[model samples]
Target: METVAINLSDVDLSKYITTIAGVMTLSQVKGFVRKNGVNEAKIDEIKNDNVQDTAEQKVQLLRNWHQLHGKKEAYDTLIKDLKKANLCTLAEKIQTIILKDITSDSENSNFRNEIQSLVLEHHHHHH
Candidate 1:
């Protein structure tokens, strides 16, 4: 559908957006969305939230939601929330996206530890 093609201006998400959205299915993304980014659904009804009606919008909605919490940095809280769910595998993949968001002007060696050790864990498991 043509619906997925329009939202706003350009922003280079690199892999971060897709990285988060990629792994998460609708429900899991909603799990990430369980915090109060959206309004109107005080109880428990997905239909009432009236999100953007798609994954991309939901992610953007999450971005909008948490971004309001702190304009400078939101990922710190968001990623930890994922881990809060015991989604360590999902957490690792997400931290990978956090790394190299703009290449050389990049983030902490925290990401270095994050993305680097994942291969060892997966490889170790595979081997």
Candidate 2:
């Protein structure tokens, strides 16, 4: 992997400064740009410099998840594993951490639905 050094001044990412963590989730990045008077379609053009994945890469990641595990089976397995390991609550916490990113709506509607389905498959990895 090429190490791409990200300097704050290199990109015009003013809207995402409010993100609590240093790096905004991809969804939050889109939302920030959209609130900055840019349309969703133009989000890529505006924030692509700072954000690592292009919209295409984000969509592909979701697709790869789907191919690896369909919805119910994946979640059921996750719940089983989490229960075995006593990590059920951690699964819920993980949901909170990623909720902003998952709901950011940067993704196409179809891909967004797919992402939600993929998360469901994980159920609770600890249980």
Candidate 3:
């Protein structure tokens, strides 16, 4: 499985997902952005709006889903570790893990692109 190269430097996610309160799940993340003064229409533009999908959110979703599905103890620990770590630091680490995993073995077809793309498109930009 080959890894995908996700360059956060080029992505500029800060434009979206400005809030940190709801970084655990996709639905929660989406709800948070919408509540934090984000228009329903611009919830995916980043530059135009101000709600992007965060690395932290992506990682949390993966961790949460894995735990829910009973994937592994390590995944369960990931959620706890993320919550314990500083949000800023955790966000970076999660982003790295996801970028590596998602791009790796693209053929798997079950990575976490749904959540990833949701965050990518659910920005408050393009308005």
Candidate 4:
């Protein structure tokens, strides 16, 4: 795996900074950006960056969780929360990561069952 190091300081964090935590939830980030009353282009740019960053976090979490413990509930909760926060696209992207691993290795099996059901549930609602 190629290691891509991103300097957090290099990215603009002002748009999503929260009072309590240095990190903001993806939904909160989006909400803050929308409420800023910025122009459409700026809003879209902020949202695009936020989504990309959040998706990377989700992928990292999934991989780390898999390394520590193989559990379906972790993914179940992640997908549920993403959908609940109206991050349907990000949920799908996370699901793709799990599904891709499953396709590549037979050992990567258990993460699929719970996530598969969640995907079906959200797919119908999203479409």
TM-score of each candidate structure, all chains considered together: 0.46, 0.21, 0.21, 0.31
Taking the tens digit of each residue's C-alpha lDDT, what string does model 1 give over 3-120?
Answer: 7853322223333555576755554555555644445353145535654355564455445445444533456655666677445455576666655452323243333353553223
The best candidate by lDDT is: 1
Q: For residues 37-96, what per-residue lDDT tens digits would candidate 3 score against the true structure? A: 345554444323324545555433333223333423333233344444333344454454
| Candidate 1 residue spans exceeding 4 A from truth | 1-15, 36-61, 102-127
Candidate 2 local lDDT, 22-97, one digit each (tens): 3224553344324433345555554555466544433332222223434333433322333343334423433343
Q: Regarding TM-score, does 1 or 2 come out ahead? A: 1
Evaluate model 4: give its lDDT: 0.41
- Residue 67 lDDT (model 4): 37
**lDDT-better candidate, 2 vs 3:** 3
After superposing candidate 3, which stretches have Cα over 4 Å from the reference? 1-23, 44-127
Error of 2 at 26 (Å): 26
Model 4 weakest lDDT span, ten residues long:
12-21
Superior candidate under lDDT, 2 versus 4: 4
Clashing residue pairs for model 1: none
Q: Give candidate 4's total backbone clashes.
A: 0
Top of the candidates by TM-score: 1
